[PDB]
Amino acid sequence: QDLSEALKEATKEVHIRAENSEFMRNFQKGQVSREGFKLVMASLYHIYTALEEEIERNKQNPVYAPLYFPEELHRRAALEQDMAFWYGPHWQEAIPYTPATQHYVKRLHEVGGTHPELLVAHAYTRYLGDLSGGQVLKKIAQKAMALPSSGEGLAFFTFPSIDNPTKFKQLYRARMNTLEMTPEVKHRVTEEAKTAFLLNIELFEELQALLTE
Ligand code: HEM
């Protein structure tokens, strides 16, 4: 069975759980505040920073290399612009770095540094979501918070080098399917994808509590 299918199957249950975290439930209903939106976007800034550091570290490693698409996919630059938008020109000392964010970053560095054959799980969990359901979330954010169609403050959700997210997702899946796969790697990759999802749920749990304190 192809890796792209194996990952979709292995994470469909946990995905349902992630959508129904209290934070995402509120987000999807259009009940996201600037305060809540800033917290989550600052946490993604740290997460994607770590993810992409490790991608760059492993760009030539054949257990990752076919998924090397910085121009199309990388989010760090977009997130910097968003941080300048939401937090102002001194954003680097204004943005929070929460413990649940630190925990996700830590696992990203473990994977990138010690288990790079699992990095695909982490890329899959973030980028394929961003190209799919992230575009729905963009539209809700825009409407909730009166964010302009010109895209300021939502650079994260914008892929100016990808014409068509569906076709690119199909390419990315096809290329995932060219990674050298053994039963051992496949099984652990799908497990790590479930972990990546849990790390995201734990962040959403944490942020909700911080908003409700
Ligand atoms: C309310 C929150 C969310 C909504 C409404 C949402 C919605 C979606 C939608 C509509 C799709 C496309 C499904 C399909 O094409 O069959 C999707 C795919 C995806 N979503 Fe999300 N999602 C949300 C949260 C998340 C979170 C928190 C993660 C990961 C952290 C994520 C990861 C993904 C991934 C990896 C895919 C690709 C599945 C695949 O094709 O293999 N989603 N999601």
From Swiss-Prot:
Cytoplasmic side, ranges: 1-213
Key words, A-Z: Apoptosis, Endoplasmic reticulum, Heme, Iron, Membrane, Metal-binding, Oxidoreductase, Phosphoprotein, Transmembrane, Transmembrane helix
Up-regulation conditions: Induced by its substrate heme and CoCl2.
Topological category with respect to the lipid bilayer: Single-pass type IV membrane protein
Site (Important for catalytic activity): D130
PTM remark: A soluble form arises by proteolytic removal of the membrane anchor.
Principal subcellular localisation of the protein: endoplasmic reticulum
Subcellular location, record wording: Endoplasmic reticulum membrane
EC number: 1.14.14.18
Gene Ontology MF annotations: arachidonate omega-hydroxylase activity; enzyme binding; heme binding; heme oxygenase (decyclizing) activity; identical protein binding; metal ion binding; phospholipase D activity; protein homodimerization activity
Subunit and interaction comment: Homodimer and higher order homooligomer. Oligomerization is crucial for its stability and function in the endoplasmic reticulum. Interacts with FLVCR2; this interaction is potentiated in the presence of heme.
Domain remarks in the Swiss-Prot or TrEMBL record: The transmembrane domain is necessary for its oligomerization.
Name this protein carries in UniProt: Heme oxygenase 1
Source organism of this protein record: Rattus norvegicus
Lineage, top ranks: Eukaryota, Metazoa, Chordata, Craniata, Vertebrata
